[PDB]
Amino acid sequence: FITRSQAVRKLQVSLADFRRLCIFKGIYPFYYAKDIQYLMHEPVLAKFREHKTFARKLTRALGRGEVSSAKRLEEYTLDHIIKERYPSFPDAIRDIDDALNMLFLFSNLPSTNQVSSKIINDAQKICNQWLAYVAKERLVRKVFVSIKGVYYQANIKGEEVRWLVPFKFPENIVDFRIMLTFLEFYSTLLHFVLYKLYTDSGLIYPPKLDLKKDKIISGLSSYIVASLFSAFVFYVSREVPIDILEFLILSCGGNVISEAAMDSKVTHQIVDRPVLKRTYIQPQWIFDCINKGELVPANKYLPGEALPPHLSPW
């Protein structure tokens, strides 16, 4: 065993890059020598050294001038680490339950100096694929509406991922650098996981997507318990999030029409206002039905009535 400082000196790699290497691989107690020896043989060290040399050469060019050289100088993924930490696809799905919370949180974070707009765009786009896949296999089984958010539980081949959907409200902003590395690793994992899931679903990947619809709602309505709400069509009022209600109905096999679409079999209308003028129903009815497949009539969730005690479904 060697000290953390001793291991860093042996690797002669700054602590900033050692954090990334440990996060990708995982080393902890003071630390066993064998883990450090295995890490030293990883190819990621060569790539990190190449990146450092690229940065120093770019700085040299910028200081000397001739910006053309810096532009011309501009000419990786941790695939190997994925296999090591995830020997098999079921292991990756198991690790998803805690890994993907960071990605889903980042999907709604605002752009700032600490996070580039590209990272947020990629995180949001990853959701557009995750929800699209989940709305085709109809693996949604829980819809606990928690204060932290709607605690979704998609039965991803029997591991019941506990991913949480943060609310659409502004998430006002800790060392994001570690969070950035975790997000990068989770996105690299998500690329292959989504590829595998789409290949299993039988749909040609990558499939076509619609952008005009994206410019209207920007979400699941693009990029092309289960027995509930068959062929059901619900109207959403101006007091509910379409991003959540529409996904559940689409997974169930129904359809949703947005009130703000211009900002029939209409069996129900989701409304929360005390004043109303379709079967008017509170949003709690859909969640309660999905949580247990009750398919209870609307009589138990008329607007303005006392809400029932929604015990946590766990």
Binding site: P110, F169, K215, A260
Partner: peptide, 14 residues
């Protein structure tokens, strides 16, 4: 602007 852009800006900043 677009409806999606306005919605995202309002729900992400304010």
């Amino acid at each position: 602007p677009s409806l999606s852009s306005i919605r995202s800006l309002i729900q992400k900043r304010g």
